[PDB]
Design a protein around this ligand. Structure first.
Ligand SMILES: OC[C@@H]1O[C@@H](O[C@@H]2[C@@H](O)[C@H](O)OC[C@H]2O)[C@H](O)[C@H]1O
Ligand SMILES: OC[C@@H]1O[C@@H](O[C@@H]2[C@@H](O)[C@H](O)OC[C@H]2O)[C@H](O)[C@H]1O
Lengths: 497, 497, 167
């Protein structure tokens, strides 16, 4: 048994829809063979796969980070604009590929328009600096009457792209990064880049890079230093996290979102420390701008020869327990709606992705597609503070792991309450009782369930055994929703009226 | 109208009773003419004033910090132990007084025993260091069979004092402090002191010094650095805050608890930053080990000539509005019961104190005595999360100040729920409605109110116009408490059965 | 040192034992004489510093006619011990050490200690503390910093190593 109070008046915050964002890098087949494949039967007049367009629309992704990631730290934006014949072929040192630049930022903006997403554009602070930063904001956002704005117009884009949210480089705390910088070096260049960007266009907002990973030797120290240098000029600090089940321990693997919770809380604390140090009235929020499961493709990638065009890198094939963890991660983002305002599932197409494609072939939905779609589609509104009493377990790395991972989201305009819930229990069903007295006249609309008896079962182009059904048994009786959550399941219990 | 949900299952934390602590320094008349006055008709066999003993006992103060405060940073503990004829007269540079050491630590422990309080003992890290720190812990806490333990026995104290909680110096960040240290210097000496003290007696807890106030140029930076140096060896970090109404603005004055709230949240954040930086599983809590109103006596103090014995320093005479602010401060400590585990009203007797005395004459209760008493006596149990909908106002330094400052404390053992509540509204009553559906069979025991028409009214030895009455109108019907909180009122609504 | 009745019992924080001081340095010198060994004497640079270092060298090595030398004589040891080789503390890089010092803090105090000890008796040699072991996070960095601080005033740098067959 587990219980949960769903009190209308105990609220965390309005969920910023941008926590359902994603990310496309010039990495493997994310662009070339992902969003863009001339000649494909479903390619439109600009070469974009219509099938991929539809799959992304169904996810209702509001914002997509672009073009990197490790790639941006060695990239020249000018290489990807203007007539194709003058675009150079480059050695991308991030992924050891030859980048033709056949797609650059203006074509990416064209694609983003088709899926209804704004773009969170990243500037190179690896090999480049403040002058390229201002020039790109000018190129994208300044109407006309300057060299760079008129250049965009000359390239065929009369109206400025009017990009709101920019990343100040990619995480360069990492020794694997092109133009790695210490926290002071990065802090200083990000501060000066931030200023010139906002002088070109004061309507923008800026994301400073947090650590590439919670396990970095410089974790926390990095964020504190970087914010000390940039606080007044920036709006968000980013965090990144990937998980994997490398020792085949499901119970420990599904507990990993408790760590994500600790990580978010830690970075919020650093933001508030620096706020107090500066005596600033401005609160800095979080952009969780890379998160996912990533591990299945590690061995296969080691066999790819360098200097090919669009190699099949990072092509994890996700299984059902992966979807459960993705589920737990989304609930964790919602739980921190008060301070996490942007998040990006890394990445959107082919590369550790909910959507996979075959060349001259179909596009299909990975297991992780479903909880993400459900969260994005039904998780708009106010995140409510959960009061839960759940049974618990210990695993290798965690203690008092609740079997139940859950939160309710209240959408007053729709008069709906959505309960997202994972039952981590590998053996037993969990009898959830939700107290819903504060929601008068609400009825159960539906109870969606994603479950599969084999946690290692994947989907594929040829069949999808791992798909949601609507046979959940949630029911209202005397101001209480009782629902059975099957063992190892993701549940969406929708209420309304 | 304001509303409030009082749900048993929406809890902040068990309140640590040590948030109702206080503090006695060798400062002015706190000791000499305060707790201790051999000539007094009401002095006991050891010179302790019995009237003061009774006044402290009624506060139920569980812990008292001693002997400083600025005094400790120049103090040699050995000067205050052993036969009185061998105790030296010293120039106390902190308060420019001659300290006779007629009272030292053993006599203080005797006094604390009488009032039922444990002692939070401070070690000198101004002119002294790690050797004096271990020796003092040995003298106080080691049973026997070493030079210092046998010395305590020889001084007349067979059983060890077994002092639990120790301060690593006094706030050393101040340029006015004896033996001021930078955050690095202090962090290092506090770390090395903490280690040897814990090796003498591993049962102890240690408090590291935070900033002397939120306005210090080194605020926040101090706490981060100090904790980076000491995290693994200490248990709490301290904060200090004093307030004053120097510009006669009551509305702004009563809002100041909002700032206290932010100050606490800032120091919690720093603790959690450093925790993450160290990858530690230990959480550090806060000791709010100096807090009060302090300003009334600033001008009188300037005229005191140096090198007297027991000068009348820091003798604020408190008024009614000071009591309201103290009440708001107390509610703010309770609302941070999850992370503030010790707090000390600075100070207990004569010195910015709830109890005042006259030589050979009476002891009396300042205005601030009452809210402190009510919080201490009725505020043991679990602090509940307030969901308050209250009207609000703007003042000079604050926006959206709730007229209602309030929290409930639920004591399961006594089966009581107590609602502490200040109405800051300077002109109008506030009709409070509380949803206590979660508390079956409860009734209103009483509704205590502290109010006076004149915010500047003081108490005195001869008359006390400012005293609580029990004619509040709180009533519980159909699972709802409705009470009228008069304008500018401190309220204690007690429920039971 | 001195009459046994005036020697205090101390809590030795290093090994959590009560040290009676029934044996101190003069009795140790007596024992070392019996086994034919010279003594490599260590000074405390944890809770103590440069004043205690010069005074100990004076007590042990200065012949007579100063407070500390005449004190050794009065304690029953007319001829000076004439200790040749001294340790400037024990390895202070360890977080388990009483009065742990960073490499800079230790380098500075060892330098100033070495100077006064040599001014009392220029015939001595000094050993500066290296790392407590090769696996310390500060290994090598420690030795470079310490020697940068002390090079001109010292003669040796120490190393420590223990081994075990735990697997
Ligand atoms: O989303 C794909 C990439 O993830 C980030 O890369 C890091 C990876 O290369 C490193 O080896 O481990 C930690 C990862 O964070 C990078 O931002 C992006 O290009
Ligand atoms: O409780 C009395 C004293 O308050 C603290 O002293 C500081 C004061 O002297 C300074 O001038 O203003 C701020 C105060 O924090 C001190 O800890 C104690 O002795």
């Amino acid at each position: 048994k587990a219980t949960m109070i769903i009190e209308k008046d105990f609220k965390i915050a309005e969920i910023d829809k941008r926590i359902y964002g994603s990310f496309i890098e010039h990495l493997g087949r994310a662009v070339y063979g992902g969003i863009y494949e001339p000649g494909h039967p479903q390619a439109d007049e600009n070469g974009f796969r219509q099938d991929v367009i539809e799959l992304v629309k169904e996810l209702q992704v509001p914002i997509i980070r672009y073009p990197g990631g490790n790639f941006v730290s060695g990239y020249n934006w000018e290489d990807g604009v203007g007539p194709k014949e003058q675009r150079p072929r480059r050695l991308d040192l991030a992924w050891k590929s030859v980048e033709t630049n056949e797609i650059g930022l203006n074509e990416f903006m064209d694609w983003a328009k088709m899926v209804g997403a704004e773009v969170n554009m990243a500037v190179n602070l690896g090999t480049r600096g403040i002058d390229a930063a201002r020039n790109l904001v000018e190129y994208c956002n300044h109407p006309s009457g300057s060299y760079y704005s008129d250049l965009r117009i000359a390239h065929g884009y009369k109206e400025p792209h009017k990009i709101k949210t920019w990343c100040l480089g990619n995480a360069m705390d990492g020794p694997w990064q092109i133009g790695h910088k210490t926290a002071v070096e990065y802090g200083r260049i990000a501060c000066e880049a931030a200023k010139v960007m906002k002088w070109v266009d004061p309507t923008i907002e800026l994301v400073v890079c947090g650590s590439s990973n919670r396990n970095m030797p410089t974790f926390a120290e990095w964020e504190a230093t970087v914010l000390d240098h940039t606080y007044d000029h920036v709006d968000y600090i980013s965090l990144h996290q990937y998980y994997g089940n490398r020792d085949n321990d499901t119970a420990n693997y599904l507990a990993l979102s408790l760590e994500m919770d600790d990580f978010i809380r830690s970075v919020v604390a650093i933001a508030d420390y620096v706020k107090a140090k500066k005596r600033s009235k401005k609160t800095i929020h979080l952009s969780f701008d890379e998160w996912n499961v990533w591990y299945h493709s590690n061995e296969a990638d080691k066999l790819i020869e360098p200097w090919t065009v669009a190699p099949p890198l990072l092509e994890d094939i996700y299984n059902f327990e992966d979807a459960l963890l993705v589920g737990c991660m989304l609930i964790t983002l919602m739980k921190h709606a008060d301070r996490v305002k942007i998040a990006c599932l890394a990445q959107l197409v082919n590369v550790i992705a909910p959507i996979m494609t075959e060349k001259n072939g179909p596009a299909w939905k990975q297991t992780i597609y479903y909880p993400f779609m459900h969260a994005s589609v039904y998780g708009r509104g106010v995140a409510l503070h959960p009061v839960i009493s759940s049974p618990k377990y210990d695993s290798k790395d965690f203690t008092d792991v609740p079997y139940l991972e859950s939160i309710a989201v209240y959408n007053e305009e729709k008069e709906e309450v959505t309960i997202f819930a994972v039952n981590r229990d590998m053996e037993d069903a969990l009898l959830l009782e939700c107290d819903v007295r504060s929601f008068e006249d609400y009825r159960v609309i539906e109870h969606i369930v994603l479950e599969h008896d084999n946690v290692k079962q994947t989907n594929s182009a040829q069949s999808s055994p791992v798909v949601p059904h609507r046979n959940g048994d949630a029911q209202l009786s005397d101001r209480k929703v009782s629902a059975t959550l099957p063992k190892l399941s993701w549940n969406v219990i929708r209420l309304g009226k």
